[PDB]
Amino acid sequence: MIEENLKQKIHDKFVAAKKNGHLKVTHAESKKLKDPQTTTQYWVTFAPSLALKPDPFANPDEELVVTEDLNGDGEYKLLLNKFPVVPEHSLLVTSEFKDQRSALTPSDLMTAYNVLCSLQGDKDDDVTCERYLVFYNCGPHSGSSQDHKALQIMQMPEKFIPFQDVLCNGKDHFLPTFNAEPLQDDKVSFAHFVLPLPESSDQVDEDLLAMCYVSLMQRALTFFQTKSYNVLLTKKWICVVPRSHAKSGPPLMLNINSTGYCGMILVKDREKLENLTEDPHLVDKSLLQCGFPNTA
Numbered sequence: 001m002i003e004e005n006l007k008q009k010i011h012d013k014f015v016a017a018k019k020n021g022h023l024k025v026t027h028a029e030s031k032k033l034k035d036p037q038t039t040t041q042y043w044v045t046f047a048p049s050l051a052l053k054p055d056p057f058a059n060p061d062e063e064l065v066v067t068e069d070l071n072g073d074g075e076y077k078l079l080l081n082k083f084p085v086v087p088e089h090s091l092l093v094t095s096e097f098k099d100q101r102s103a104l105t106p107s108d109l110m111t112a113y114n115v116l117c118s119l120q121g122d123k124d125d126d127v128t129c130e131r132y133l134v135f136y137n138c139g140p141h142s143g144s145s146q147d148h149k150a151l152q153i154m155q156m157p158e159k160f161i162p163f164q165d166v167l168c169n170g171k172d173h174f175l176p177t178f179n180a181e182p183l184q185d186d187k188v189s190f191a192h193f194v195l196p197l198p199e200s201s202d203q204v205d206e207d208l209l210a211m212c213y214v215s216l217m218q219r220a221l222t223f224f225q226t227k228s229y230n231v232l233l234t235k236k237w238i239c240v241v242p243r244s245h246a247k248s249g250p251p252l253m254l255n256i257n258s259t260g261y262c263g264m265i266l267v268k269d270r271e272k273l274e275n276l277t278e279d280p281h282l283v284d285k286s287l288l289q290c291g292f293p294n295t296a
C-alpha cells in the first residue's frame with residue numbers, strides 16, 4: 001500500500017530542502033492567455049534564468065528523497081524535483097534503472113493515480129482549487145532531457161482550464177471500441193488522445209488505467225507506424241500526445257515537454273514571451289511543430 005500522510009511528507013521535505021540549499025526554485029512569472037483562433041486556454045510561464053541553461057536518479061542525494069520505497073514492493077522512490085518551477089514538483093522514479101523510452105507498466109500508471117489521490121482529497125471540483133498533473137516525457141522528441149524512467153507530479157494552476165477539461169465535460173468515462181474513439185478536440189492543430197475517468201477513484205484500478213493507456217498509445221503510435229510521446233494524467237482524464245520534435249520551428253522555437261500539451265508553456269526569453277502575448281495562436285502552431293497534425 002502506498003504511503004500515507006504523503007502530502008505533509010513532501011511539503012515538510014520541500015521547505016527543508018529549499019531551506020538547506022539542496023534544490024533551487026526557478027524564479028518565474030505566469031499569466032493566462034486565450035487562443036483567439038482555437039479558444040484554447042494557455043498558461044504562460046516566463047523563466048529567463050533558464051536561458052542560461054544550454055543518471056541523476058542513480059544515487060539521489062538523501063535530502064531529495066521523500067520516500068525510499070513507496071509501496072510494499074521495492075518498486076518506487078518518490079523524489080523532489082531538484083530544479084522546479086512549480087514548488088513541491090515531484091518525481092516517481094523506478095527503484096532500478098529503467099529506460100525513459102520504456103513504456104509505462106500498468107503499475108506505473110497505477111501508482112501515479114494513487115499519488116494524485118493522496119494529494120487531492122477530492123470533496124469537489126467545486127470546493128478546492130488544488131489540483132495536480134502527472135506527466136511522462138518519453139523519447140528524444142518528448143522534451144526528455146533525461147534517460148531514467150521518471151513520472152512527474154506537480155501542482156496545476158488555480159484558475160486555469162486546460163482544453164482537456166472542456167473536452168471531457170459531460171462525456172462519461174469509456175474506452176474506444178467502435179462508436180467514439182478516445183476524445184479529440186478538433187479545434188486545435190495537433191494530434192492528441194484523451195479519455196475521461198470515473199468520477200470516483202473507487203472505480204479506478206491498475207486494470208483500467210492500463211487499458212486506457214494502451215489504447216491511447218495505439219492511436220498515437222500510428223504516427224510512426226523515431227518514437228516519442230507525452231503522457232498526461234489527471235483525476236479527471238488521461239491523455240497521450242504523439243510527438244515529432246522536442247523544439248518548435250521558426251516563430252518561437254520553444255522547448256516543449258508534457259506540460260505544453262495541456263497549455264502550460266515555459267518561456268525563457270522575453271521577446272518570445274512578448275510575441276506569444278501579442279499573438280497567442282502561435283502557441284497552437286508551435287504545438288503543431290513539436291507534434292503531429294490534429295487528426296480529429
Ligand SMILES: Nc1ncnc2c1ncn2[C@@H]1O[C@H](COP(=O)(O)OP(=O)(O)OP(=O)(O)OP(=O)(O)OC[C@H]2O[C@@H](n3cnc4c(N)ncnc43)[C@H](O)[C@@H]2O)[C@@H](O)[C@H]1O
Pocket residue numbers: 045050056057064079080081082083084085086091137143144145146147150152255257259260264265266
Ligand atoms: N539531480 C536531480 N534531482 C532531482 N531532479 C532532477 C535532477 N536533475 C534533473 N532533474 C529533474 O528531473 C526531471 C527530468 O525529467 P525530464 O523529462 O528528462 O526533463 P524535463 O522534465 O523536460 O525538464 P528538463 O530539465 O529536460 O528541461 P526544462 O527546461 O523543461 O526544465 C524545466 C523544469 O520545469 C518543468 N516544466 C516544464 N514545463 C513547465 C511548465 N509549463 N510549467 C511548470 N513547469 C514546467 C520541468 O519538468 C522541469 O522540471 C526534471 O524535473 C528535472 O528537473
